[PDB]
Amino acid sequence: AKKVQAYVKLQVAAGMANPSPPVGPALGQQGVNIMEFCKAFNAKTDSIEKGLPIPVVITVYADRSFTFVTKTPPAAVLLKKAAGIKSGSGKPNKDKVGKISRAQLQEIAQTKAADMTGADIEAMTRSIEGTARSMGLVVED
Amino acid sequence: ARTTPIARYRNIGISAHIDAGKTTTTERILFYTGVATTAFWSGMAKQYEPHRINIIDTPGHVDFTIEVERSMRVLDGAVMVYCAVGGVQPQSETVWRQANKYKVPRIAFVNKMDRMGANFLKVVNQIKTRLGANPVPLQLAIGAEEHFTGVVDLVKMKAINWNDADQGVTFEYEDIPADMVELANEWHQNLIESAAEASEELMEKYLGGEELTEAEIKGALRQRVLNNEIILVTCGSAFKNKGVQAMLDAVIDYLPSPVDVPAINGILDDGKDTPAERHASDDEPFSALAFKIATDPFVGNLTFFRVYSGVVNSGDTVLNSVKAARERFGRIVQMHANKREEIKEVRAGDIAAAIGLKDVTTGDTLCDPDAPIILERMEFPEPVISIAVEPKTKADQEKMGLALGRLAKEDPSFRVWTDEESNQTIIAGMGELHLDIIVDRMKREFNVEANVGKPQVAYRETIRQKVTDVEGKHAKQSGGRGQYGHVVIDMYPLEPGSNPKGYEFINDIKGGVIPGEYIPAVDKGIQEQLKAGPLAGYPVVDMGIRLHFGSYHDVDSSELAFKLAASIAFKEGFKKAKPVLLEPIMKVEVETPEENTGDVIGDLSRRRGMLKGQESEVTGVKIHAEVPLSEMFGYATQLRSLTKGRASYTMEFLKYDEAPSNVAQAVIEARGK
Amino acid sequence: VTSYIGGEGHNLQEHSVILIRGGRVKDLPGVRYHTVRGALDCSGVKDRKQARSKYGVKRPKA
Numbered sequence: 080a081k082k083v084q085a086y087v088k089l090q091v092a093a094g095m096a097n098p099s100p101p102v103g104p105a106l107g108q109q110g111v112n113i114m115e116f117c118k119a120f121n122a123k124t125d126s127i128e129k130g131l132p133i134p135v136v137i138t139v140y141a142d143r144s145f146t147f148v149t150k151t152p153p154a155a156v157l158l159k160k161a162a163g164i165k166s167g168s169g170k171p172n173k174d175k176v177g178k179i180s181r182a183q184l185q186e187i188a189q190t191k192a193a194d195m196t197g198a199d200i201e202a203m204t205r206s207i208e209g210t211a212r213s214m215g216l217v218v219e220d
Numbered sequence: 221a222r223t224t225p226i227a228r229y230r231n232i233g234i235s236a237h238i239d240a241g242k243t244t245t246t247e248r249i250l251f252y253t254g255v256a257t258t259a260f261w262s263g264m265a266k267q268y269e270p271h272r273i274n275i276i277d278t279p280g281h282v283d284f285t286i287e288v289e290r291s292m293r294v295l296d297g298a299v300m301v302y303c304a305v306g307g308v309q310p311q312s313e314t315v316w317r318q319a320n321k322y323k324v325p326r327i328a329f330v331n332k333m334d335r336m337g338a339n340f341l342k343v344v345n346q347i348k349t350r351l352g353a354n355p356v357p358l359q360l361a362i363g364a365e366e367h368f369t370g371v372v373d374l375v376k377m378k379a380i381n382w383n384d385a386d387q388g389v390t391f392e393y394e395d396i397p398a399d400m401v402e403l404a405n406e407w408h409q410n411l412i413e414s415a416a417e418a419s420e421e422l423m424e425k426y427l428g429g430e431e432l433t434e435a436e437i438k439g440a441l442r443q444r445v446l447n448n449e450i451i452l453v454t455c456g457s458a459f460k461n462k463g464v465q466a467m468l469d470a471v472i473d474y475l476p477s478p479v480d481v482p483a484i485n486g487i488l489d490d491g492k493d494t495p496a497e498r499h500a501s502d503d504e505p506f507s508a509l510a511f512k513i514a515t516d517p518f519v520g521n522l523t524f525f526r527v528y529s530g531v532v533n534s535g536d537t538v539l540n541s542v543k544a545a546r547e548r549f550g551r552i553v554q555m556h557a558n559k560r561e562e563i564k565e566v567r568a569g570d571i572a573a574a575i576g577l578k579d580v581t582t583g584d585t586l587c588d589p590d591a592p593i594i595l596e597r598m599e600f601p602e603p604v605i606s607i608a609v610e611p612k613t614k615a616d617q618e619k620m621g622l623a624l625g626r627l628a629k630e631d632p633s634f635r636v637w638t639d640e641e642s643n644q645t646i647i648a649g650m651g652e653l654h655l656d657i658i659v660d661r662m663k664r665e666f667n668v669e670a671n672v673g674k675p676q677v678a679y680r681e682t683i684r685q686k687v688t689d690v691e692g693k694h695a696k697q698s699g700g701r702g703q704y705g706h707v708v709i710d711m712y713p714l715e716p717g718s719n720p721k722g723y724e725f726i727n728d729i730k731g732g733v734i735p736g737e738y739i740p741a742v743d744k745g746i747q748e749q750l751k752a753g754p755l756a757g758y759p760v761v762d763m764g765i766r767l768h769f770g771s772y773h774d775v776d777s778s779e780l781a782f783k784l785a786a787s788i789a790f791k792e793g794f795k796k797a798k799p800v801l802l803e804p805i806m807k808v809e810v811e812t813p814e815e816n817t818g819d820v821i822g823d824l825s826r827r828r829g830m831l832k833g834q835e836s837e838v839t840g841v842k843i844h845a846e847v848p849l850s851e852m853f854g855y856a857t858q859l860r861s862l863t864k865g866r867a868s869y870t871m872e873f874l875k876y877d878e879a880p881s882n883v884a885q886a887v888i889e890a891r892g893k
Numbered sequence: 894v895t896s897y898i899g900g901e902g903h904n905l906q907e908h909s910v911i912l913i914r915g916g917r918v919k920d921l922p923g924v925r926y927h928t929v930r931g932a933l934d935c936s937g938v939k940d941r942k943q944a945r946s947k948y949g950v951k952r953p954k955a
């Protein structure tokens with residue numbers, strides 16, 4: 080990685096291809112190639128399941144080369160994956176969207192502790208509790 | 221009889237960004253030589269046999285880069301003029317790409333070395349970094365700004381000092397200034413290395429430590445310029461008069477003759493598109509390209525043409541293969557130095573003008589009738605801006621048509637049509653400064669008094685509410701026999717563009733209440749009313765009508781009586797149906813540098829442009845926006861202002877959307893007034 | 894004067910140097926002059942192989 084001047088964390092997908100049009104955001108007042116991105120991700124795509132947008136950064140070095148920062152499909156889209164109900168954001172308190180058990184996130188928190196980095200696997204569970212209610216979820220065992 | 225070899229001909233363009241000094245450099249050329257213009261050059265030291273230089277001075281503005289394209293295509297070599305202060309400009313990159321498209325072997329002249337901030341080596345580095353070129357300095361500037369005295373010749377390793385007292389007509393070779401000897405030796409080695417790369421034999425001599433002769437250096441650098449591998453860079457400044465003379469020597473030494481350029485490609489007029497070539501020889505069949513038409517007040521149409529092969533005489537019926545029109549050549553002159561020697565022998569390589577050709581346009585091939593060929597065609601870009609032009613009087617009306625016709629003939633990138641809806645004459649061009657010049661010529665050369673406005677937005681009409689049981693009863697039983705007609709219709713909106721006809725008619729008549737013979741007259745009565753809407757008198761679109769109820773009278777019922785009833789029913793129903801005024805929206809695409817991106821959208825937002833998205837490209841960003849036609853006027857010059865002249869937009873008609881309540885209502889009121 | 898347009902579909906744009914010939918149509922009172930559809934702004938008209946001299950069409954390809 081490098082400084083936060085060649086920092087945009089991005090890439091909703093890899094099969095939608097070009098990360099320059101609407102699908103792939105950013106690519107503004109920065110300057111870098113676009114097809115020079117997904118080829119290293121082509122050796123990296125087939126471990127991630129689709130429907131799970133993974134955050135990676137266009138980190139450009141000082142010598143024009145750029146690869147990504149492998150993360151992990153995160154909190155938000157796994158509750159659209161492991162529960163089975165998508166974004167719907169705005170209503171945590173109006174009508175019931177879905178309740179999630181305690182252990183349903185902990186089994187994928189070991190996968191998500193390679194996505195989220197504060198300290199630990201258990202410690203990142205209460206921020207999977209975060210964006211779920213912003214999507215509109217409720218959580219109780 | 222070997223007179224002046226065609227290998228001594230230099231058909232050259234002078235090309236530069238707007239405001240760089242290229243015709244003043246050409247006026248200097250004419251002064252030194254002795255004088256499209258023909259000149260003769262023997263070298264600044266008179267070291268050469270007389271060479272014929274045909275000069276095309278190409279426009280600096282991007283609104284007239286269509287003329288530059290025509291010139292580049294018809295020319296052999298080019299002199300690219302750069303400002304020593306400004307360096308490579310956005311407009312220079314455009315001209316550079318055009319010269320690359322036509323593979324024109326070219327050299328470089330860094331002018332304006334007498335101004336503040338002049339830096340030769342900075343411009344050399346900008347030619348490398350911004351144009352992707354391989355610049356090889358032939359010269360170094362001695363001093364800069366007010367201290368600019370002369371140039372170092374890196375081939376001869378001598379300073380060139382021009383005499384200020386004779387406006388640079390004489391010069392002396394001096395020893396290189398002691399402060400420049402190290403820099404001159406460095407760039408001389410870079411020049412020799414660049415010469416050695418032209419062939420394996422010269423590379424072996426150079427690596428062996430053998431000194432290359434001046435003739436080998438010049439021959440090697442010439443070969444690579446002809447291959448477009450390198451660009452030779454010269455410098456100098458007029459007023460005190462420097463560089464031009466040595467740049468003209470570089471034109472002789474390094475730019476192509478007509479025999480150094482590949483044969484011109486064409487197609488035989490055999491209906492099979494068979495490829496053919498024409499070599500630069502007097503013994504080949506006649507072939508020429510018409511590349512400029514100029515309207516002259518005294519002689520009429522001047523058609524400028526460049527002969528590629530064979531010979532023609534003033535007064536020779538040739539064949540315009542492109543237009544299949546036998547065109548007898550008119551009076552043909554030639555700018556022999558200062559005089560205009562009328563030539564009855566236009567040989568290969570020559571540039572001349574013919575008087576009074578009728579059916580010749582820019583890009584037409586003129587050839588031998590017994591050996592038809594179509595030389596490759598010029599593609600003309602689509603116009604990017606349009607304006608409405610209205611004549612003040614009826615005398616101006618007919619005169620406007622005539623004037624605009626002449627302007628469209630000489631300049632293809634200029635288009636003129638009558639808009640079928642507004643009946644306005646629309647003119648379209650390659651930028652607004654382009655249209656400004658066109659309008660100036662129309663209201664001066666032809667002196668046609670016209671108002672310049674904006675293309676009238678094509679307003680449409682529709683309803684936003686189903687209305688049922690709308691009675692229309694034309695019961696006129698008076699004046700001899702009666703005329704009875706009675707219909708009941710439902711009116712409803714369609715989804716915009718859901719029907720290619722913009723109109724649906726449903727016959728749901730049950731019980732023969734209306735004879736089947738009168739149903740087409742009812743539909744026709746509605747369709748005539750659709751042409752002139754009851755709100756503001758615009759065409760009505762996106763509407764369905766169901767005729768389901770009606771009545772006739774055995775003696776008094778008429779086809780047109782039912783058509784009158786249909787119109788009544790329609791006019792009453794339409795007023796109840798909440799009628800609205802429509803609008804067109806235009807899909808706009810803007811290509812801009814990444815740093816200029818922001819400004820483009822700021823203005824587009826004020827122009828009600830709904831930015832759909834963007835496609836960050838190599839130049840910068842390809843922004844896409846939905847912008848009303850009304851707000852898409854005068855954008856060419858506005859964009860040129862925000863982007864410092866490096867942006868290009870396109871626009872197409874998208875769909876017939878709904879005009880914002882405010883906009884629609886305002887126009888409805890104005891139309892009613 | 895008011896002229897008459899021959900053929901069945903023209904190539905007109907309201908400011909066009911067109912040529913006039915005699916002949917009354919007997920069907921529009923006040924229209925007494927024909928035009929020529931072979932001269933100076935009206936080319937060889939569409940879709941015709943017979944009586945080509947009238948309406949100015951050249952002979953077809955073969």
Ligand SMILES: CC(=O)O[C@H]1C[C@@]2(C)[C@@H](C[C@@H](O)[C@H]3[C@@]4(C)CC[C@@H](O)[C@@H](C)[C@@H]4CC[C@@]32C)/C1=C(\CCC=C(C)C)C(=O)O
Nearest residue numbers: 238239277278279280281284287513514515630653657661
């Ligand atoms: C310098 C040069 O070679 O171009 C000149 C030459 C120029 C294209 C002129 C603008 C305009 O009258 C041109 C028209 C279309 C004017 C109408 C006709 O008579 C054409 C047959 C003619 C061709 C050349 C000419 C006479 C130029 C200018 C003016 C310089 C100013 C600006 C806007 C930078 C141009 O570059 O736009």
Ligand SMILES: Nc1nc2c(ncn2[C@@H]2O[C@H](COP(=O)(O)OP(=O)(O)O)[C@@H](O)[C@H]2O)c(=O)[nH]1
Nearest residue numbers: 236239240241242243244245280332457458459
């Ligand atoms: N001082 C100085 N002025 C120049 C030089 N070359 C051109 N000019 C001036 O700059 C202006 C622009 O010249 P012109 O040839 O019309 O530029 P073009 O638009 O590139 O053809 C003229 O009015 C000249 O007087 C130069 O070498 N030195």
